[PDB]
Amino acid sequence: NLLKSLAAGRCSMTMFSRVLGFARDAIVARIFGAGMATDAFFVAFKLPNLLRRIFAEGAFSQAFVPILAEYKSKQGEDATRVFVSYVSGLLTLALAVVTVAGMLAAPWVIMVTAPGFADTADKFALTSQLLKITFPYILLISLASLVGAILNTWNRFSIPAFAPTLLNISMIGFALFAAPYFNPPVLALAWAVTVGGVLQLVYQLPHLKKIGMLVLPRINFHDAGAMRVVKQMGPAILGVSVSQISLIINTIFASFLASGSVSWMYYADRLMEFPSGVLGVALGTILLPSLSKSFASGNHDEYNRLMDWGLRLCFLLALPSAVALGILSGPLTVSLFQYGKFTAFDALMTQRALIAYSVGLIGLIVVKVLAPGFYSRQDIKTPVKIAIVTLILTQLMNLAFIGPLKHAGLSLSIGLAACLNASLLYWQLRKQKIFTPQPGWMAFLLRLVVAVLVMSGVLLGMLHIMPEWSLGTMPWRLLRLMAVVLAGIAAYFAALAVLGFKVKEFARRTVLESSGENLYFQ
Numbered sequence: 001n002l003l004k005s006l007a008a009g010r011c012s013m014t015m016f017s018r019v020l021g022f023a024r025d026a027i028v029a030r031i032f033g034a035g036m037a038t039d040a041f042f043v044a045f046k047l048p049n050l051l052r053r054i055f056a057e058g059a060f061s062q063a064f065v066p067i068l069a070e071y072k073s074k075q076g077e078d079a080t081r082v083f084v085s086y087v088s089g090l091l092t093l094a095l096a097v098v099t100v101a102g103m104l105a106a107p108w109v110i111m112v113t114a115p116g117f118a119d120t121a122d123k124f125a126l127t128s129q130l131l132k133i134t135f136p137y138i139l140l141i142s143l144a145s146l147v148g149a150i151l152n153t154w155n156r157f158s159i160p161a162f163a164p165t166l167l168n169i170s171m172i173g174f175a176l177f178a179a180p181y182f183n184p185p186v187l188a189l190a191w192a193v194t195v196g197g198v199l200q201l202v203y204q205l206p207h208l209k210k211i212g213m214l215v216l217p218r219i220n221f222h223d224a225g226a227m228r229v230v231k232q233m234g235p236a237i238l239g240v241s242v243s244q245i246s247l248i249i250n251t252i253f254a255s256f257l258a259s260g261s262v263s264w265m266y267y268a269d270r271l272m273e274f275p276s277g278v279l280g281v282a283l284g285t286i287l288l289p290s291l292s293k294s295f296a297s298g299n300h301d302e303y304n305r306l307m308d309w310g311l312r313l314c315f316l317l318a319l320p321s322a323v324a325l326g327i328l329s330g331p332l333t334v335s336l337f338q339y340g341k342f343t344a345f346d347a348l349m350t351q352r353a354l355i356a357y358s359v360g361l362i363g364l365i366v367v368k369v370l371a372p373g374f375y376s377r378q379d380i381k382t383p384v385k386i387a388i389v390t391l392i393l394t395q396l397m398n399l400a401f402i403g404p405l406k407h408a409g410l411s412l413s414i415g416l417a418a419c420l421n422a423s424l425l426y427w428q429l430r431k432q433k434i435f436t437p438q439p440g441w442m443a444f445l446l447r448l449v450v451a452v453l454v455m456s457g458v459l460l461g462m463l464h465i466m467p468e469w470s471l472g473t474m475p476w477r478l479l480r481l482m483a484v485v486l487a488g489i490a491a492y493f494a495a496l497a498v499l500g501f502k503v504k505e506f507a508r509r510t511v512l513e514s515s516g517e518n519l520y521f522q
Ligand SMILES: CCCCCCCC/C=C/CCCCCCCC(=O)OC[C@H](O)CO
Pocket: 381, 382, 385, 386, 389, 424, 428
């Protein structure tokens, strides 16, 4: 069963990792708030935060491991050290020159990414400085992602799954203990990121030495295998990470809005990163390997059947989560962030961006299902072309929404674009005659919609009997939040079982048995 790969140890490590990342953002919100200095940091954190997410969500492993597994097995450990050396060298060289260039041209990078910060000479100079300190992370996090994939190919798993923790450990310790000794104190966060990057790599190196895969990076532009790996890294991200690239571009527009517009968008996107990340990783861990296996063997039925099951798991979990985040946007922002320098105005500005983001949770998760359907057949070009159309239309919605809705309209542009990205991938899988659904989708969706209203009704009613969400310290707020969340989860799954949906049966679908057997026992 393909579902035995989710509860394979790291299930308690997804928990520890998500909790500790929450703990970082809560601590950052307390000590630094959502203003000038966090604005500057969150701009300089944009590209690092994008790469961290790839390594924490195991995305590069999902891509590199099949390449390295194929070419360890057919043609050798001795040749695989060489391949890794050539892959490692290209990554290092390419990213070393980018990092150095970006550090010496840091003010000009901010002129492109946050031009509205040029009205504020002191805010601009700080952003440039923070970006200079955090560039080396881009190299550091990329080598760590490669190292983690080598370990994962050799079936270690636990050491690379833990390394993402180290960044949040670094930033928490710096924010709590080192920040007073810096001026301005946000400089501690920047150094914490680069130190976190050093730790995320150095943590994994000794275990690589044990498997004989610690090789000194070298350059050889004639290795076509090394060139395709690095060259198709970007296009592969772009086809599955348009929302995250749109945050970076929206920063241009947000640089002209009120103080904290960048921060309010950051905190709202982290809150949504929880259902996005957890569900996206789980769906990816199950889909891409098995779908690639079926495509390799011509198993058209099991390709099509796992496709349909995953897209039903998608709507089953994303739709209630999306509505729940919207309904609970206020309670979530007050209970998790409204402490210290993060005020109730900050909480409302974060809530409004979250409600906008909420519209696109379902699209983000459908993309995590539909893009693999192309990637399994070695078609990057179709998701990439869709990605480019989506980026262009996101920026057009910015021009339409920034007026009335400010930073929330820039958030909504990302939300509606994920729904667009997903529907363009479905239309392409149907026109190209690759996926055709199983029967009963309309009945399946209608029971979900009814169960979601039931959940919403219980959610809204629970919010009415509860006090103001700022009442009490953090334990009391969180305890009340868990009472409202448990009531929603219970109502949602209670309504599905009344309407006749078997969650337990859904997890024992026959396609899951044979897909797991066909993939694990290759
Ligand atoms: C609201 C506005 C919506 C606008 C929507 C715009 C259209 C989006 C479609 C993209 C075409 C994708 C086609 C991808 C390539 C198909 C051709 C093909 O199969 O080429 C493979 C090639 O041979 C490999 O080398």
